[model samples]
Target: SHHHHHHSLEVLFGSLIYTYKLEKYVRTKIFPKILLIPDKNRYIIKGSFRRRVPFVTDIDVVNNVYPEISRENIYDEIIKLVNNIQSDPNIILAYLSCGTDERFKISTGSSKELSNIQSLLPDNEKNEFQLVLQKKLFFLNELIWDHYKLRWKPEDVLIGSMNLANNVSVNFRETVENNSTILLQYYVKLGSYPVGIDVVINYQKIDLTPAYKNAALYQLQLANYSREYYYMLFPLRYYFKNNQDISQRLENIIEKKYGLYKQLMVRIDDYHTLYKSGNLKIDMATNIVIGILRDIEKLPGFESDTIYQIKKVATNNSPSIKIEEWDILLKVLYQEINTAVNNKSRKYFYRYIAMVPPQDRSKNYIS
Candidate 1:
């Protein structure tokens, strides 16, 4: 086995949607570097990372360790393997698994670090609506890691047993929106980026500021109790200098682009807006608008390019776009919404929708 080559991977894997860097690094790196190696046991990353929530305290991974080779003392061995390629200073961990029925659960110093990784996501406030449901849109994106995480529940029902994930909220939208592989072809379009990379890794002498930019995500899903189910894959990334330039550019673009220049937008402008005015509460509005938007997004758009632009950004991934083009597109669409609904025949409906803050109107549908 000396001078080994031909690294055959035993890794039959699936997908994850995430919020920060560590999980994505674990997902992208652990699978290739640690989990897939021959004779290696399987595990899953647990805790906040597994849940796809933003507050991951540690990169805790758990898996089964077969005791076939020798004395069972190398639990630390796997951690060493992970540490070698762990670019960020954050703690990446590994655990040996016991047979069957396994589940687990963060820590201190995590507050500031969690915030740093949170910055890697395209700001959710820009898209608004702060429920685990509506907010996971950018969290599901594979564009930032500095890569991303998976595992969350409902389907924890699935991977932990028999269920489905592709039917989740993110999958439905990311499928239709990008069509660039994410939308029309979601099934095949799950993997993602390491934020920005130099062309030849295109080295540039740089400050390498913004820790979030150099982030990578992973969860070390080396845990498997069965061969009966195959899982899904999702996309993500982090940072460097040349990459940071691209990162800041995207940040500026998201900040500078469309936001309804004037007020009194639309009754169905977004999810959370009407959520408060009088009726719908909690997650009800997020659930309500998502259905509404998906239907309209699916209807065939004619010669107008407006619907096309909306279709592009309206996904789990929220892929890159041209600011000037969509800027005009939204303004044009607002005119249409205003024209269609505001015949002055609908004053009360407009009144209710208007009472809420102006921004919530557009962000939800963008979710």
Candidate 2:
């Protein structure tokens, strides 16, 4: 135990993105003011926003009504809210509402655009429900809509446009639907796509075309891949507390791939190709292991309790890297490693994840 253990630290708490402790437990910690405004509407953040990984897919929101006075005024309030939150462009914020009141939707003209499953919905809680309040029902619609937008691309969100439904080809000419005509009351503006899709009422209960189930699940998978990246580069997070710094060269490679303030659309097809080939793991293992081995050449006797991170040749280094909210301070212990193989010298440095408090799946505001 070095000065690191004195920090009362846990080891590098490593897990894939889906880990309950990593994602759900740290939700409130990262976004403490997630529900920034209480009065205007109780913002229900659904989807991968609170959990999921590779950072963000997007923030899913379903707003409580009874905020703006009239139907006309609702769009005004939405405009204000969207503009403010969207200041963080990488957020990819999505808001949804379901009902006949001509809700807010983004449009790109030409009557075409927007799409749908991003299941942030858990099944209905019933017997305990004494009555169904209209306000809650509004969110139910929104949550359902959240699933659609996050799952499929704009073209695929529609009914006839899908190539597969219930695992069969749709075999029909794809036509843009006017079903959502009443839905898009105000076309705020377009970014990459439109608001969401309008499925046949029955589709909600039964058949799903285009088989977004794969894409939807892939959404989470995409997030998990980011964690693999995190796992690979994580050694640098808490490299040295002495100066609180890391080598800028390694830091540069990491942030370019993983440290964006925005989002990414990865070519999972290549991930598909690379995985079965075993190259992704083998490639990373080969490089990192070799990378660590070179450090061993300089220092040698890395007997026990080690992290093969950096072998610094000294520098005028400050904290060249910044810590994300999720970073856990590592308890470091360095060993003066030496091995004489006809006179060889080696040194190793390393340090410490456990005791995760089970944070419940809290769907409401942090009380």
Candidate 3:
């Protein structure tokens, strides 16, 4: 009886960027007033991060008034904003730098890495981001949750082009003219859900065409979640592909979609590549297995009492991984995943989607 009653805390960990729980669950702990502005012009700076300087409405004004505005000063400017914002209960809301790990990691730019799935998202949601290029979205959930216990609703917030990282923002400002733009509105509605692409993409790989780093897993995850959620909101519109099943009888019990969809997207791609080519190194392969099993834990039957068993099996097989049993289990999980995506897409379909970078005619401006 005691053995059956054993339990443990569900701790989700990863780069705050790749981990959905940080965005979905942990970020909610902050209750700061967030200002999400897309352009530097939109930012109303009030202080220096280090010198405790006052707000400067315009960089030109700051330059003219306080000749102290150097690459270093702007960096301090960010810390000042952060210190001031946190000085009250307002947290920083912004995007990423044009050239850095944050750019790829946080993806706060003219467009996010989700350009491939852009067509699949709701139109209106799509259109809002339509004009900007490298439209990256950023969050400070980690910083907030790490330091404070405040709770922030995802729907209660909007994300714009304000860069967060010290070094990164400078690059974004110089190269993009702060080619910044806000996602404008938060439509996820749940108040708990996060916006922007959840999948992992390298900042350096944004220019790669056809986007075929690994699509099958990503698409499989998409197809699965889309199918499941599509049925939830529009039960009649539920559709299946790749001979997937329509009877996702269990999805009705759960509410979140994007987090799971994104996780599945990450794993399906990682597993398929590692399984077929076996080109990945050992540590990378193990990490993928860990990621895959974590997402699997979200499913109904995959929610097992013996998580150790799942972990053991997942850990034991890699590089030359084989999971004949996991294949069947994963199929059901993927099917439910598909259903969720399909349904989410239907609701998403009505939203506007914006892609493509803004045109820069000046030699000084480049996104």
Candidate 4:
């Protein structure tokens, strides 16, 4: 009951706080001191002073070691670091330097550069370098998700989402042309870091500091809603047109879903107000947003889909729609119309319909 009460407070008040004494582990007292030396063509994973902390807890990877990690051994070294980091959730974080230019170069190398590297390596290792690098990056993100459980939109995680990117002029190839370096940091939480650890990358330190602050977590509410909501259209659109009586029930369900969405938006607005007024903590706002999302997820309407009885009907009617592209466009139109009806935004309804490509009326596939 007490825990639930706390959770309710977090949801309602938009406040959630977590405190960690990372400074103590890395800077203050500096117990469980770790060392990494890059010398003699080896990236040494070495740490000592475990006797002071009993478990060698609280380790920090020193910055400016980017140059020491050659492209040749980057994956192996990163994998080794990840293995060590995953062992202790309480390790807090590892601070390392990244060459923004270097990373971007690797991320968007020219065709010649890629072919040159491929030509140099044996057939087996020809593609190995890129594969290893890609795997390492993915592995790092996976670790963050495992330990943090933060939600970010697929677009936010990468640069774009498939649907939006498909419609947009700027694609991935265009992006790499003008790309800049980005920072990559690792974090570990208390009660989660592994034990008995002292290791560091052996590298020469550089003086480059990151120019931007990265968001540690993402606001995944609308991004997730948009996806789930898109899928729901497949069923909702079919049922509303084919099964009128059941359609009313679906409408009612969506009404409730929209009500919850509106309430969530109101709370979000309140949070922004409070945050701007300097009455709320950033973490509290973040957690409150997260809390509302968690609550929304539990609502039947938020996660609703068509019933099995309707699925059969919808499937039987599926063949009536010929163009695969039309299926999606029509479903999207139905969803937009539903939103307009619920929100009483007739102007938007008309506008959206007007934007729909003129269907080929000459075709025999009329409703």
- Among all candidates shown, the one with the greatest TM-score: 3
Per-residue lDDT of model 3, residues 1-367, tens digit only: 7689778878764211323443333234321123222223332222111111111000100111122333434434434434444354222222222222333343243345343223232434445544444212212212222112211212121222223323222232343222221121111111111222111112121332243333333333333332343323332212221223322322221124344554464345434433333233445445555656665565554344334454555656543443543443455555555655655555443221111123311111111
**In model 3, where is the ten-residue run with the lowest total lDDT?**
56-65
Please list the residue runs of candidate 4 whose C-alpha ends up more than 4 Å from where it truly belongs after superposition: 1-22, 26-62, 66-73, 89-187, 190-367
- For model 2, what is the alpha-carbon lDDT of residue 256? 36
TM-score of each: 0.17, 0.22, 0.25, 0.22
Error of 2 at 358 (Å): 36
Please list the C-alpha lDDT of all candidates, in the order they appear.
0.29, 0.28, 0.32, 0.33
In model 4, what is the error at residue 27, expressed in angstroms?
4.5
Model 1 Cα shift for residue 267 (angstroms): 41
Local error of candidate 2 at residue 255 (angstroms): 24
Candidate 2 positional error at 105, Å: 17
Candidate 2: which stretches are off by over 4 Å? 1-41, 48-58, 67-70, 82-367
- Among these predicted structures, which one has the highest lDDT? 4
Candidate 2: how many backbone clashes?
Answer: 13
How many residue pairs clash in all the candidates, one count each? 44, 13, 74, 11
